């Protein structure tokens, strides 16, 4: 497969750094152990490294999972352009086929029209809005 996860849990010293920059202070490490430690123990989270021919090209990750849904987030490598939709692919993929919940859900910005856009090409609808958010779902069924 050209396109591959890799689980946070499973991160190796180089990776952490580097992603969470998108020379480290001892407590900047530490609290990124800390958030690694908390997902071992967390099944309602799940983050992914997403690589693209060994080469990293972002980040996303699904969080309140239950039996029927989630959240999901995703985060493009900063100076990537045209990745937005893989990753998207990826989110849905995983969330319908691994998950097997029956609707994915997100909150973005309203300011943050990237995301709305792909999200909207991609089959999801807004059903909420408040001060800060838009919130959108999609379901398989």
Request: hydrophobic share 40%.
């Amino acid at each position: 497969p050209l396109i591959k996860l890799k689980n946070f849990t499973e991160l190796n010293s180089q990776e952490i750094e580097l992603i969470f920059k998108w020379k480290t202070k001892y407590i900047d490490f530490e609290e990124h152990l800390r958030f690694l430690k908390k997902l071992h123990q967390d099944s309602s989270k799940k983050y992914f490294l997403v690589f693209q021919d060994e080469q990293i090209i972002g980040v996303i990750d699904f969080v309140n999972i239950t039996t029927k849904s989630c959240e999901f987030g995703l985060y493009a490598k900063p100076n990537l352009k045209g990745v937005g939709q893989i990753l998207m692919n990826e989110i849905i993929k995983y969330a319908f086929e691994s998950l097997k919940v029956n609707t994915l859900k997100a909150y973005v910005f309203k300011s943050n029209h990237k995301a709305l856009k792909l999200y909207q090409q991609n089959h999801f609808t807004i059903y909420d809005e408040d001060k800060d958010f838009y919130y959108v779902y999609l379901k398989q069924s």
